């Protein structure tokens, strides 16, 4: 996260770190959506142009974390993966359309002060909140600058951007399964996700019911925090029928 701040303890108890076993390193962010299911970006797991194709045994999920590099004894919990499910129409060839994946954990994780699921949006909450100018919150342990790494989880709040502005900021074909967020050059304030934040959540706190909803997944960007560029996020609600199909079928 560029131009964010240190998270408060327990601020994002749904945040998940995807952790490579060997070499031991941060692969991506992710989020906890139930005691057995974790949501992330497909490109965190499968990206053939970079020879990336992780299997379940390659990775661990670390939940309840705050420190990036510490083993947070008595606080974090580490889970093994039972199965990865990538959206069948994830477009790794072109523009990362439908950049979404689920991971089922081998065992349920115990909830705590530090570990708690985020809600997924209904059609109504999405319609109400996914509006240009409305701000969400992005969290992660990724890079602090485009070109180092944080001691603890970082957080930044960023406004959703009008679709024509998103489209006019890039040569990439933008789809309805994406949205973009960030400040405009004339808006002064700054901030973006960056490498290593991929797969983590873009959340909004509903003013109707007090609950946090995950509206987006950190998907892609051209550099990080560049003037006139925006971060792009997977539109979770648009892909929720797939999410539900997977959870209904596989538990």
């Amino acid at each position: 996260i560029v131009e964010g701040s240190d998270a408060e303890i327990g601020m994002s108890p749904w945040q998940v770190m995807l952790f490579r076993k060997s070499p031991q390193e941060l692969l991506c962010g992710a989020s906890l959506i139930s005691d057995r299911w974790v949501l992330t970006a497909a490109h965190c797991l499968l990206y053939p142009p970079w020879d990336k194709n992780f299997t379940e045994n390659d990775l661990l999920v670390r939940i309840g974390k705050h420190s990036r590099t510490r083993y947070e004894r008595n606080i974090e919990k580490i889970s093994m993966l039972e199965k990865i499910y990538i959206h069948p129409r994830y477009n790794w060839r072109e523009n990362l359309d439908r950049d979404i994946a689920l991971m089922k954990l081998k065992k349920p994780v115990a909830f705590s002060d530090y570990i708690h699921p985020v809600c997924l949006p209904d059609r109504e909450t999405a319609a109400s909140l996914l509006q240009a100018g409305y701000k969400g919150r992005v969290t992660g342990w990724g890079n602090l600058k485009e070109t180092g790494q944080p001691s603890v989880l970082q957080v930044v709040n960023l406004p959703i951007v009008e679709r024509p502005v998103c489209k006019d900021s890039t040569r990439i074909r933008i789809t309805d399964n994406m949205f973009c967020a960030g400040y405009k050059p004339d808006e002064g304030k700054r901030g973006d996700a960056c490498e290593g934040d991929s797969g983590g959540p873009f959340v909004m706190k509903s003013p109707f019911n007090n609950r946090w909803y995950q509206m987006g997944i950190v998907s892609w960007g051209e550099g990080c925090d560049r003037d006139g560029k925006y971060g792009f996020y997977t539109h979770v609600f648009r892909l929720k029928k797939w999410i539900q199909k997977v959870i209904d079928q596989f538990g």
Binding site: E8, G10, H116, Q131, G136, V155, N157, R211
Partner: peptide, 28 residues
Amino acid sequence: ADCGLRPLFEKKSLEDKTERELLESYID
């Protein structure tokens, strides 16, 4: 049923340092 309610914040009626910025942006 309990999704999205944080033990150290909503469950104890404490607010984090920047959630108000989000609320102020929700102008409907």
